[PDB]
Design an enzyme around this catalytic site. Structure first.
Site, PDB file in Angstrom:
ATOM      1  N   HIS A 157     -16.610   0.407 -25.064  1.00 22.08           N
ATOM      2  CA  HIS A 157     -16.376   1.505 -24.131  1.00 22.08           C
ATOM      3  C   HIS A 157     -15.109   2.299 -24.437  1.00 22.08           C
ATOM      4  O   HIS A 157     -14.938   3.384 -23.875  1.00 22.08           O
ATOM      5  CB  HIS A 157     -16.372   0.994 -22.681  1.00 22.08           C
ATOM      6  CG  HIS A 157     -15.128   0.272 -22.254  1.00 22.08           C
ATOM      7  ND1 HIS A 157     -15.036  -1.103 -22.231  1.00 22.08           N
ATOM      8  CD2 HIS A 157     -13.952   0.736 -21.766  1.00 22.08           C
ATOM      9  CE1 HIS A 157     -13.848  -1.455 -21.764  1.00 22.08           C
ATOM     10  NE2 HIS A 157     -13.168  -0.356 -21.489  1.00 22.08           N
ATOM     11  N   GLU A 163     -20.664  -4.829 -25.673  1.00 21.63           N
ATOM     12  CA  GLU A 163     -19.308  -4.284 -25.635  1.00 21.63           C
ATOM     13  C   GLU A 163     -18.467  -4.661 -26.857  1.00 21.63           C
ATOM     14  O   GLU A 163     -17.244  -4.465 -26.834  1.00 21.63           O
ATOM     15  CB  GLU A 163     -18.593  -4.740 -24.362  1.00 21.63           C
ATOM     16  CG  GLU A 163     -18.865  -3.862 -23.157  1.00 21.63           C
ATOM     17  CD  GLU A 163     -18.558  -2.403 -23.427  1.00 21.63           C
ATOM     18  OE1 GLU A 163     -19.514  -1.609 -23.421  1.00 21.63           O
ATOM     19  OE2 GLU A 163     -17.368  -2.051 -23.659  1.00 21.63           O
ATOM     20  N   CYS A 169      -7.783  -2.332 -23.278  1.00 22.56           N
ATOM     21  CA  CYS A 169      -9.051  -2.810 -23.812  1.00 22.56           C
ATOM     22  C   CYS A 169      -9.071  -2.640 -25.324  1.00 22.56           C
ATOM     23  O   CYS A 169      -8.527  -1.673 -25.870  1.00 22.56           O
ATOM     24  CB  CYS A 169     -10.214  -2.089 -23.154  1.00 22.56           C
ATOM     25  SG  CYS A 169     -10.643  -2.811 -21.515  1.00 22.56           S
TER      26      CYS A 169
HETATM   27  C1  LIG Z   1      -9.888  -1.526 -20.482  1.00 18.75           C
HETATM   28  O1  LIG Z   1     -10.640  -0.342 -20.631  1.00 18.75           O
HETATM   29  C2  LIG Z   1      -9.971  -1.984 -19.015  1.00 18.75           C
HETATM   30  C3  LIG Z   1      -9.040  -3.157 -18.782  1.00 18.75           C
HETATM   31  C4  LIG Z   1      -9.080  -3.641 -17.337  1.00 18.75           C
HETATM   32  C5  LIG Z   1      -8.815  -2.503 -16.363  1.00 18.75           C
HETATM   33  C6  LIG Z   1      -8.114  -3.165 -15.155  1.00 18.75           C
HETATM   34  N1  LIG Z   1      -7.456  -4.323 -15.684  1.00 18.75           N
HETATM   35  C7  LIG Z   1      -8.033  -4.618 -17.048  1.00 18.75           C
HETATM   36  O2  LIG Z   1      -7.711  -5.519 -17.751  1.00 18.75           O
HETATM   37  N2  LIG Z   1     -11.365  -2.387 -18.801  1.00 18.75           N
HETATM   38  C8  LIG Z   1     -12.121  -1.917 -17.654  1.00 18.75           C
HETATM   39  O3  LIG Z   1     -11.628  -1.180 -16.850  1.00 18.75           O
HETATM   40  C9  LIG Z   1     -13.577  -2.371 -17.477  1.00 18.75           C
HETATM   41  C10 LIG Z   1     -14.499  -1.321 -18.059  1.00 18.75           C
HETATM   42  C11 LIG Z   1     -15.971  -1.757 -18.087  1.00 18.75           C
HETATM   43  C12 LIG Z   1     -16.814  -0.534 -18.442  1.00 18.75           C
HETATM   44  C13 LIG Z   1     -18.264  -0.815 -18.797  1.00 18.75           C
HETATM   45  C14 LIG Z   1     -18.539  -2.101 -19.567  1.00 18.75           C
HETATM   46  C15 LIG Z   1     -17.610  -3.281 -19.326  1.00 18.75           C
HETATM   47  C16 LIG Z   1     -16.156  -2.888 -19.094  1.00 18.75           C
HETATM   48  N3  LIG Z   1     -13.794  -2.510 -16.048  1.00 18.75           N
HETATM   49  C17 LIG Z   1     -13.192  -3.584 -15.297  1.00 18.75           C
HETATM   50  O4  LIG Z   1     -12.384  -4.313 -15.780  1.00 18.75           O
HETATM   51  O5  LIG Z   1     -13.600  -3.726 -13.961  1.00 18.75           O
HETATM   52  C18 LIG Z   1     -12.601  -4.053 -13.043  1.00 18.75           C
HETATM   53  C19 LIG Z   1     -13.329  -4.528 -11.783  1.00 18.75           C
HETATM   54  C20 LIG Z   1     -12.332  -5.006 -10.739  1.00 18.75           C
HETATM   55  C21 LIG Z   1     -14.132  -3.356 -11.217  1.00 18.75           C
HETATM   56  C22 LIG Z   1     -14.244  -5.683 -12.193  1.00 18.75           C
HETATM   57  C23 LIG Z   1     -15.549  -5.777 -11.729  1.00 18.75           C
HETATM   58  C24 LIG Z   1     -16.346  -6.844 -12.127  1.00 18.75           C
HETATM   59  C25 LIG Z   1     -15.841  -7.816 -12.986  1.00 18.75           C
HETATM   60  C26 LIG Z   1     -14.535  -7.721 -13.448  1.00 18.75           C
HETATM   61 CL1  LIG Z   1     -13.865  -8.952 -14.560  1.00 18.75          CL
HETATM   62  C27 LIG Z   1     -13.746  -6.661 -13.048  1.00 18.75           C
END
Ligand SMILES: *[C@@H](O)[C@H](C[C@@H]1CCNC1=O)NC(=O)[C@H](CC1CCCCC1)NC(=O)OCC(C)(C)c1cccc(Cl)c1
EC number: 3.6.1.15
Length: 170
Positions: free
Chosen positions: A31, A55, A136
């Site tokens: 992503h 991913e 990421c």
């Molecule tokens: C890097 O892009 C970023 C790193 C994250 C952000 C917040 N703290 C981090 O370490 N990754 C994301 O933001 C990630 C993107 C998705 C996009 C589509 C495919 C998979 C990755 N999203 C993310 O980490 O979600 C955060 C939550 C709280 C919404 C979440 C939901 C469900 C499970 C988890 Cl582990 C986290």
């Protein structure tokens, strides 16, 4: 304790980071990969083999891009219980090696997508010890005897930050 040369493999890329496994092999989180371009690092796409699995994205360049580097072990995740280091670079230049005890490889629901990968528990937010947006692609690594091993790329983390997720290769 990752040495300087291993940190030198961590490279700004798109909206995140990637990692030089070898002079020609670069891995990152899908992503963060830039879309719409006709080149990476100045090389035409014609000159790059792209392997994507969920991913996890891997590039193999025809040109030696990091000829200063040796190859290293790339594995599809690691055994539950493994303590890995997440080699987090921040844009200030600060290095934040994050120790993480890796759980099971699984398909996880994340922001509504099913992602093959591996969760881990940091060893968080209030102590500013966690991952944040922009991290990421950072590699998950561990040392096995005299071999450094990379086994995932950073993809997500909990609200608490105490649990992270790396993408792992198929
Ligand atoms: C890097 O892009 C970023 C790193 C994250 C952000 C917040 N703290 C981090 O370490 N990754 C994301 O933001 C990630 C993107 C998705 C996009 C589509 C495919 C998979 C990755 N999203 C993310 O980490 O979600 C955060 C939550 C709280 C919404 C979440 C939901 C469900 C499970 C988890 Cl582990 C986290």
């Amino acid at each position: 304790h990752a040495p300087p040369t291993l940190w030198s493999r961590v490279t700004k890329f798109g909206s995140g980071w990637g990692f030089w496994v070898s002079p020609t092999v670069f891995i990152t989180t899908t992503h963060v990969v830039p879309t719409g371009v006709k080149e990476f690092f100045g090389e035409p796409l014609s000159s790059i083999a792209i392997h994507q699995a969920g991913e996890f994205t891997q590039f193999r360049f025809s040109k030696k891009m990091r000829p200063d580097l040796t190859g290293m072990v790339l594995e599809e995740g690691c055994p539950e219980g493994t303590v890995c280091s997440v080699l987090i670079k921040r844009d200030s230049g600060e290095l934040l090696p994050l120790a993480v005890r890796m759980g099971a490889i699984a398909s996880m629901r994340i922001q509504g997508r099913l992602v093959h990968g591996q969760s881990g528990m940091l060893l968080a937010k209030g102590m500013d010890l966690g991952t944040i947006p922009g991290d990421c692609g950072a590699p998950y690594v561990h040392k096995r005897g005299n071999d450094w091993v990379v086994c995932g790329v950073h993809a997500a983390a909990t609200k608490s930050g105490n649990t992270v997720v790396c993408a792992v290769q198929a």
